[PDB]
Ligand binder design. Structure first.
Ligand SMILES: C[C@@H]1O[C@@H](O[C@H]2[C@H](OS(=O)(=O)O)[C@H](O[C@@H]3[C@H](O)[C@H](C)O[C@@H](O)[C@H]3OS(=O)(=O)O)O[C@@H](C)[C@H]2OS(=O)(=O)O)[C@@H](O)[C@H](O)[C@@H]1O
Ligand SMILES: C[C@@H]1O[C@@H](O[C@H]2[C@H](OS(=O)(=O)O)[C@H](O[C@@H]3[C@H](O)[C@H](C)O[C@@H](O)[C@H]3OS(=O)(=O)O)O[C@@H](C)[C@H]2OS(=O)(=O)O)[C@@H](O)[C@H](O)[C@@H]1O
Lengths: 370, 366
């Protein structure tokens, strides 16, 4: 049920160099230097727990951060994170809503609250009309402010994979949650039609016939995580083949893609728990081979409005790549000269200033910059 | 050695340790389970969403455990430097005394990797006294037998705090830490003090034994998690040697070992978490291996916990007894013998075989 494509409210995009995405939180205000860094990205999602130890709440920390970004670069697009079912902390208005309205939280068929794996974070019962209205208004009100361009909707997949809630609250309640989810996304599709809606939705799933593409009709694009984390008995290569296919199709349909890929395992060095975390050599040859590989996966998929983030977590103060620009982000890229060519697990693609070769079996790639 | 305050111990079957938290009160069944262990540490965030605070949730839990088995020994967790949440008395103390928290030279708070949990500045006398009294007051209550002191190694590895507040402030933190542990050694001399202290470290020529004189025993973690460029096998060799020496000297050992991959199945994030078959052949091989490491080290007052995290409601082994915990074990008939990376040890009802290099063990039960 995709809408006719209208790019009026889309972020800036250029093929000149790597198109980059930022997805970030910090417990206190960003420094001036950090704001300048954020404002250099074309598309930024502000996560939950947004500077709440400076501004008292995520709502106020989001407003302050977005204002500061826009004053440095008013062309940067800023999205507000919102989880559609998990009642995470540090939203002052959510705390008040739940305090005053305990019936807003999700219960199992034995009338017990159900929780995330930490045993303490509960869920919104979005089947209840007043919860739907509270949640929708909270998103619409924040997006209507001058420095927020849209919203990042999270936990779509927890709604849509039936076992996630059916194992907690039963089969019928899962279907009711899903029905209400669709109602709520229909509401946002209309109310935010002059804004951006990005969702955490494309994902290799045995339950999804089209690996999330069938759910993109509500959204201007998808964020990607778990993209190289195989499951379901599939090999790493098999799993990436399906994710690449889905991402290519979505990107070629004009949807925004924000592909996140973790470097945490390539940076970890067995330090930082009971000793100082050893400074990572960001020029390390092996680390840069990993950057090449992950960027090759992205470039095999990318179209206009595709953006990449190679991250060490979304908390700014605990990320080894915070404030850093890899050399691969500065080199001339240029527009594609064709689609990727797939031969088994080997992919190639040509850009005006770059040739990409990717082997998913060996988890190696070459970026030959021209 | 004064054993008068030590826990019960028997070689009849595997000697077990429990180390646990839950956000709400334990059920009756869960209290009975806890009371079946000879030694239990109640972690931070102890039933605080039922009792309002870890302090009162600890008191309620300990009272219930002791009513079911008054011989069970119950320890109160206390972190010597990290200001973790859900202690109502700490929240009051820190709100009234913001200067109690550790700051750098710019008077900025420094934090754990989460960027939000700060540290006690134990270089300040009033912080030392608040902390010591908080431990002594809780241990003095009738259903608590002692304390589990955590984060010793964050004080004693100089880079942990020097990288945050400088080498000289770290040296002062260390000096104050030793003063505090000398104080506790005396005030808790009729109680138990267990510390997270034995650990393979390049900074520790004796891998933590040089600090064990303050305490009745050591808890072990990170025991099979190599670092510093060391092989897994040689890292375990050094930990085994430290643990053997401590146990043979009469110190309590509580060895925790994470079940690890064997109990992880790549589900539960966006889908239902699938049952891991607790009678699986491969899991049972991992249990055999981890218990073999323990048994190569164990002496009287050594206890083991093979875990899937310390949060009861998120652990696949909560309330579970592996078959290896029920079989007759019996007293050791000699110390372990080390031949390369292969260790053997005989007990009255068990022969242990262990190969660190392949991470394999054979338990031959009689
Ligand atoms: C602010 C922190 O929130 C919880 O941690 C989350 C974690 O959030 S973080 O901002 O990435 O650190 C992250 O949340 C996911 C993230 O939002 C991406 C974009 O989409 C989903 O994967 C999010 O997960 S979920 O909302 O569907 O669950 O990952 C979660 C699993 C949490 O991480 S966890 O490892 O801590 O469980 C808190 O748990 C943190 O303590 C912190 O408050
Ligand atoms: C209650 C939780 O506290 C923090 O989580 C800790 C975690 O605590 S837990 O009770 O095991 O879940 C654990 O703490 C360690 C544990 O106490 C052992 C016995 O000794 C040290 O290793 C403790 O760590 S530390 O105090 O020296 O840091 O491990 C920590 C690293 C934390 O786990 S973490 O992965 O979440 O960082 C909170 O972070 C939890 O959210 C929760 O509030």
């Amino acid at each position: 049920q995709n809408q006719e494509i209208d790019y009026s409210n889309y972020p800036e995009f250029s093929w000149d160099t790597m198109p980059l995405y930022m997805h970030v939180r910090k417990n206190t205000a960003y420094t001036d230097e950090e704001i300048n860094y954020l404002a250099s990205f074309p598309l930024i999602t502000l996560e939950k727990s947004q500077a709440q130890n400076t501004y008292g709440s995520t709502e106020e920390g989001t407003l302050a951060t977005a204002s500061a970004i826009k004053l440095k670069n008013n062309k940067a697009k800023v999205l507000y994170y919102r989880n559609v079912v998990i009642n995470w902390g540090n939203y002052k208005n959510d705390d008040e809503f739940i305090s005053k309205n305990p019936s807003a939280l999700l219960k199992n068929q034995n009338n017990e609250l159900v929780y995330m794996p930490n045993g303490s974070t509960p869920f919104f019962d979005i089947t209840k009309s007043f919860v739907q209205e509270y949640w929708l208004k909270s998103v619409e009100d924040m997006v209507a402010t001058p420095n927020i361009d849209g919203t990042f909707i999270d936990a779509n997949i927890k709604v849509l994979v039936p076992s996630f809630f059916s194992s907690k609250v039963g089969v019928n309640k899962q279907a009711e949650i899903e029905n209400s989810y669709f109602s709520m996304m229909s509401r946002l599709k209309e109310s935010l039609s002059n804004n951006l809606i990005l969702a955490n939705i494309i994902r290799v799933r045995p339950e999804f016939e089209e690996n999330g593409l069938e759910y993109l009709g509500y959204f201007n694009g998808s964020y990607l995580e778990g993209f190289d984390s195989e499951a379901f008995g599939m090999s790493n290569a098999e799993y990436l083949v399906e994710g690449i296919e889905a991402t290519q199709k979505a990107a070629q349909s004009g949807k925004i893609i924000t592909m996140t890929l973790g470097l945490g395992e390539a940076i970890d060095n067995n330090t930082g728990i009971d000793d100082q975390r050893e400074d990572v050599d960001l020029n390390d040859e092996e680390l840069n081979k990993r950057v090449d590989y992950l960027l090759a996966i992205f470039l095999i998929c990318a179209e206009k409005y595709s953006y990449v983030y190679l991250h060490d977590g979304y908390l700014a103060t605990n990320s080894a790549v915070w404030l850093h620009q890899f050399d691969q982000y500065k080199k001339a890229l240029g527009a594609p000269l064709g689609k990727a060519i797939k031969n088994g697990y080997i992919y190639t693609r040509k850009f005006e200033n770059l040739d990409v070769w990717l082997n998913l079996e060996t988890q190696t790639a070459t970026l030959t910059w021209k």
